[PDB]
Write a protein that binds this ligand. Structure first.
Ligand SMILES: O=C(O)c1ccccc1/C=N/OCc1ccccc1C(F)(F)F
Ligand SMILES: O=C(O)c1ccccc1/C=N/OCc1ccccc1C(F)(F)F
Lengths: 115, 116
């Protein structure tokens, strides 16, 4: 599993469950092509988005639909979604974890790249 | 000044100086149209992007060119940029500050929204 997404809720101190996540890849014509998507599990995690052979070098965008999450909890949010745009680089055997921590008016995101 | 941007560097403990910032507004046809741009000052701040009259209700995107910033320091960072997408003035006109804290493999952003 070369690409994982983990989403946390900073208000409730819990995994952010049932959050929609969309992944896009930049095509040579500078357009976002849909690549993978899913909803976070009860652990706030989304696995199995792609395979090693499909996950090639390129520019990727991970979109986290935070607005619908906060609305379902009855909280007025600021952002439309959280976006994370990065370059996947094949230097060696690498796995990418995109982690996001969510509050109604703020979010943080980090990339953990391991073997 | 209804829209300000402030950018900090978490590695050096300083304002992030000379960072390019681009603001887009979602147009009628679902396309992102250019709205304003600038560079952060020696204080890490960017003011004067727009006026109250031109900053109407809409969906806005603030793109902070973090990659160019880290590269100029010799760091190959993870993100291409930091993007912040939000609806503005949906409840009437407000003053927005978009703040971002940058590290090579991480960033955080928060909005401070005040009523004049
Ligand atoms: O990521 C991971 O492999 C991970 C896996 C399992 C459980 C927790 C984590 C890490 N979750 O990190 C949350 C986060 C995300 C973005 C910025 C800052 C944070 C902080 F809360 F850690 F500060
Ligand atoms: O910067 C400033 O003087 C500033 C100016 C106007 C409004 C708010 C602020 C502060 N903003 O707080 C930045 C910060 C601090 C600690 C963690 C994370 C952040 C982040 F917002 F950058 F993400």
């Amino acid at each position: 599993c070369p690409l994982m997404v983990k989403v946390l809720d900073a208000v409730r101190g819990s995994p952010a469950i049932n959050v929609a996540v969309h992944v896009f890849r930049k095509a040579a014509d500078d357009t976002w092509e849909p690549f993978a998507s899913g909803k976070t599990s009860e652990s706030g995690e989304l696995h199995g988005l792609t395979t090693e052979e499909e996950f090639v070098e390129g520019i990727y965008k991970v979109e986290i639909d935070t607005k619908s999450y906060w609305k379902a909890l009855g909280i007025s949010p600021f952002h439309e979604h959280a976006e994370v745009v990065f370059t996947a680089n094949d230097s060696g055997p690498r796995r990418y974890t995109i982690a996001a921590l969510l509050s109604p008016y703020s979010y943080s995101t980090t990339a953990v790249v391991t073997n």
